[PDB]
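User: Need the bound-state model for CKX:
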Amino acid sequence: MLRPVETPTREIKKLDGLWAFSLDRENCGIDQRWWESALQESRAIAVPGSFNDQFADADIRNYAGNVWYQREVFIPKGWAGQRIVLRFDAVTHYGKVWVNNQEVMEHQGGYTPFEADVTPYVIAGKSVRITVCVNNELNWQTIPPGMVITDENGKKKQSYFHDFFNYAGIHRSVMLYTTPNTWVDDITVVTHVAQASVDWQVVANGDVSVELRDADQQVVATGQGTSGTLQVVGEGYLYELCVTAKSQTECDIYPLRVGIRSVAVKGEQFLINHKPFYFTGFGRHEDADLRGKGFDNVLMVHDHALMDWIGANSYRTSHYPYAEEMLDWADEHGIVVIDETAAVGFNLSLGIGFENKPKELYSEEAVNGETQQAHLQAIKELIARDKNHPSVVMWSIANEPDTRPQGAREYFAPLAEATRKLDPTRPITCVNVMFCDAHTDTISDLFDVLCLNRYYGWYVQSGDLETAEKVLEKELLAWQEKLHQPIIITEYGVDTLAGLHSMYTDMWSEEYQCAWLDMYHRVFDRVSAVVGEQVWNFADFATSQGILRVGGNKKGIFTRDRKPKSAAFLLQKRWTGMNFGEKPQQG
Amino acid sequence: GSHMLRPVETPTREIKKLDGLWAFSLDRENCGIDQRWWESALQESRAIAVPGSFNDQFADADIRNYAGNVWYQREVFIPKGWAGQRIVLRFDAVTHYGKVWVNNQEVMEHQGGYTPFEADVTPYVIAGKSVRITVCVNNELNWQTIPPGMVITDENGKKKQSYFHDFFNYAGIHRSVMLYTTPNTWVDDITVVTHVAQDCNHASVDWQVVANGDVSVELRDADQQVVATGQGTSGTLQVVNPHLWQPGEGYLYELCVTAKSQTECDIYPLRVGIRSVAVKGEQFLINHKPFYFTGFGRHEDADLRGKGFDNVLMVHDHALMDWIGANSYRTSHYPYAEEMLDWADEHGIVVIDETAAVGFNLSLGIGFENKPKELYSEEAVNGETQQAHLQAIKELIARDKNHPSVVMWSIANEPDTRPQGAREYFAPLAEATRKLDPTRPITCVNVMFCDAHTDTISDLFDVLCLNRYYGWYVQSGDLETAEKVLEKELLAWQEKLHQPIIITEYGVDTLAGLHSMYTDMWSEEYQCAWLDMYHRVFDRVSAVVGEQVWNFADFATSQGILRVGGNKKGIFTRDRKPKSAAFLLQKRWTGMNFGEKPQQ
Ligand SMILES: CCC[C@@H]1NC[C@@H](O)[C@H](O)[C@H]1C(=O)O
Ligand SMILES: CCC[C@@H]1NC[C@@H](O)[C@H](O)[C@H]1C(=O)O
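Assistant: Bound-state model below.
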C-alpha cells in the first residue's frame, strides 16, 4: 500500500471537516448498532484533528472508551464504472468503520493508513452514511502500551508510560479513492550509488511498463517488466519514474518520485552518497494548540520555515509515524528523517512521583509474545508505506526501552533481525534511555548506529553544568569504544518557560537553556563518534498532568504557538555557522 | 533558655547598628581563622547590606551557592554619655552559625539561625572611641543542626550543601544588629501568665529575674492609667476587670516593671494581653470560646534580600493578609522576626510559633539519583541532635513566651514517624516542651504520608496539624478522588485522636498567567477549584478548626525538576501580586463571621 496520487486515478477528499460526533460513555454503540441510524444527540467535529481539545471540555478531553463519527457522502457520478475504495490516512489507536449498515473496515494502529474496496457497497451518484468507531485505549498488546484501570465505580481511566498526551480521534486525511480496474497494490524501488543504479517491482493485474523521467520529465530511461536495473549519468534532486500498467482494456498510470538514495554505515561515519554527515535538527512532535495531533498545512509550512531559518537539516519523527505529507516535503526539500514507530513506553523505570504497576517488565503480565507480534506489525506497516521515500534515512525500532530486566534481548533480537529482513537499504537504530548507560545496556549490539537521549545536568546532575560536562564526556568515550559506532544524540534539552530570566543561570531560565545546550555542544565538538545532534523538541507540547510538567513539556526551543526562546538564536548561530553536513571541529 | 527580653526604649537606650553597609568577603579556603582576620581590616572586601541574605545581593551564582565561612565587618563609635552603664551587643539573627570579635576580643558564639544572642561587653569597650566589629558567619548544616543537612565535598574539596527542606538555605545576618545600654541594675528576664474565668475578671501571675535589686510593678492601661500594682521578685499577682486580648482587636496592657537598686533605677515596659488559650475535646478555645484559624503558612522571603527583615515588606504583607480576611498564620519552618510577633500582638493576629526543625525526613525528595538508610540512627538524627532540638525549643519559647499572639508551639514540621525511634526521639522533646511552657498547646505538623493508620507520634501532642495535598502529589489532577481520600482521612484522624485538627498546609503550584478551560494542574483555575473542594470537605468535618493555605507568596527553593523558579504554591507572586485564587479566599474569609467555622 502507498499514498494515492491523482492522474487518471481519482479521489474526493473527505476531510470535509464537520462530521457528526458523539461519545459512547455507557458502551451502547455496537449493541444498538449505531451505524444503522443517524447519531442520536451529536455535535459537530472537525476531521483533520484530535477530538480531545476541540470542545474546551475536560470530560471529553480525559475521556476513555468508544467515540463515534458519522458523515454522509454523495459518490461522484463518473465512477459508476470503477472500484470505489475508502482510505483513512490515520485513525489514532483503533478504528472500525461501517458504510451504510455494512461493516467494511477495522484497524489497530494510530499512525498508519488503512483502506478497503467498497465498490460492491456503493453506487455512484447517491449518498451513503459513513460511521466510524474510534477507540483510544492502551493495553500491553498495543503500540504504544498502557494499562486501563477501572475504579470502584466502573469508570475507566487510562494509564500509559510515555511523555506526550494520549490524543486520539481522526487525526489525518479521510479519502475516497478510485483507480482503474486492473492495478491495485504496491510498488517498490531501490537505489544505488558508485562512489547510479535502480530496481523495480510492481504488483497489479497485468503487464507493466516503467519509464524514469527527470525533473523536466523527459524520459531518461525505460524498461518494462516487474524487475531489472536502469542507470543514470541543501535540498535534493528527485527524479520521477512513471510506472504504467498495460492490461485488460484499461491502462493505469502511477507516478512515483524517486531520489538517488544510497546509504549504509561505515565504521564511525554516517555516510551519505559516500559522504560523512552531521545530523542537525530536532526531535519533533505532532502537537498544536487546538487540533491536538491533527495535521494542518499551515503548521507544516511554518515549522519548516522555522527549521529552515534555524539551520536544521534533519529531524526525527519522535515516537510515532508522522503525516506522510511531511516526508513528501522532506523529499522535495532534502530533509534527512529518522523514521520511528509508535513503540514508546516499554519502560517502567521512568515514571517519577509519590504513587501498582507490573513488577517484571518482560513477562506474560506485560510485554509478552502478543506484544512482540503487534510490535512487528507496527514496524511492518511503517516500512510498508514509507519504503520508497528518499527522505527516510534510517528506521528506529523503539524509543527509550528498559533493557535492564531479564528477557529484553530475547524480545528485541527477532525484531531487529526481522526489520533488517524488511528493508536492508537503510540502517537500523533503537534510541537509548539515560539509565541504560554504556556499562548496562543489553541490546545496543544489534543496531547499526546507536542513538542516545541524555539529560545530564537536568534529571540527574541537579543543575550543575560543571560536573554534567565531565559525566557526559566519559560516557561518550565509553559508548564509542564499547561499540565503535556513530553516535547520534537524538534527545538533549531542558524545560525552560519562555520569560523566566535569571542572573544566576538557574534551571528553568532561558539563560540555563542556552548555557546547557552549548556546553553539550562543546563536548560534541571533542568526540570522534558523535555524527548527529537533534535537540529535545522544537516546540513545547502537551503531556498528561503531573507535578513534573507545567502545562506540558516545556523543553521546546519554541513555545507551543511557535515563538522563539533565546536558545533559538543560539542554535541558529551554530547550525548555520558550520558548513552543510560537516561537523564543527574542536577549537 | 538563657534570659533575654526584647530591647525596648525606657529612660535607658539603644543605638541601631544595622547601618547596612558593612565590609563583606567570603573565606573560600578557610584562611580566616588561621590569619585571624578579625585582627586587621578585611582584605579585599565589597559592600554588603545588613540585614539581608548575602546570597542574592550580587546577582552571582557563585556566591549564591557558596558553602563555608563569610566575614562581615564594621567600625562603630560608642557614644560617650554611656560611661558607667552596661553596654550589650545583640544580634537578633545570624543565620546558622556566628561568632564575633570586638576588634580582638571574642564575645559571643551561636548556632541558632533565627533567635537572638547577646553578651555583656561592658568591660571590652570604653565610651568615646570607635571599635571594629568582625563577624564570622557559617552556613553549613550537619545532622546536629536545626534544621539538619549534609555538606558534601567533591573530588576537588569544594563544599555543596544538601538539605531536606523545600525553601532555599539563605544565610547571613538576617535581622537587627544592635548596641544597647542599660543601667547597672539588671532586669534580665520577665515571665507573665494570664488567667480568665467568664470574661469578667482575673489575674496574671508573674515571675521575674532581675539580677540587681528590688522590683515593683504596675500594670497600666491603654491610657497608661494604673490599674494594679505588685511588689516582689516573683508572685506579683494582681487581679483586674479587664478588656481582654481578643483576635479581632488585641487589647494590650503594659507591665511596667521597675528595678530599684540602692543608687540605680531600671524601667522595663512589657506589653501584655489578657488571653487564655486551651483545647477541649475537638475545640480550640480562646477566652473560653471556640476559634477558627484562617490564613497561611508564610516565609521570610523576598526578591533581593532573601530572608532579611524589612519594614515595608511587613507593613504591605499585613495589609494583604488583612484584606484577604486572614486572622492567623504560622511562622513556617523557623522562628520569625520578633517585629512580626509584636505586630500580631498589637493587631490581634493569632500565630502558631514553630521552630526550625524541618527536614527530619528522607522520604520527601523525589528524583533519579546517597542519603542515610536509618533516619533515627547514630549517623543521622542522633542524641546530639535531640539535645540540639531541645535547645532550639528552649530559645524560641524563651523569646516568644509573653507574646499574646503566640497561641501554640510547634516542635517540628513534617518529620517521618514511620521508622522506629521516631517516638523515642520526639517523646522527651514533647514532654520537655510541656514543662518549658504549660500555657499554650503543643503541636507537631504532620506529613502527608504518615497517614492516620501510620503515624507514630501524634499521641504526644495537643492539636493535630495536617499538611495534605490529595489531588496534587497523589491523585494528581483528579478532584473527585482527592475529595473522597481527603474526607475519609480527616474523619479517620478524628476517630483516632478526637483532637482539634488544623490544616496547616494545603495548596497547589500555580503559574500566574497560566489559564486553562480544562481545570488542569498549574493553572489558576485549578488553584481555585482545588482550594474550593478542600473547603467543602473542611466544612463537612466537625473537628477541623483551622485552615492555612500553603503559602502566601511564591518563594525560592533549591534547584530541581519539581520547582519552576521556586515553589509556586503562593496565593501571591513573590512581588505580592494576587493570583485568581486570592479572590476566592477573600470571598470566603470575609464572608464567614469572624473566628467562627462556616456552618456548611
Ligand atoms: C529522561 C527521559 C527523558 C524523556 N525522553 C523521552 C521523551 O519522550 C521525553 O519527552 C523526554 C522528557 O522527559 O522530556
Ligand atoms: C508533601 C510535602 C509538601 C511540603 N510540605 C512542607 C513545605 O515546606 C513544602 O513547601 C511543601 C511542598 O512541597 O510544597
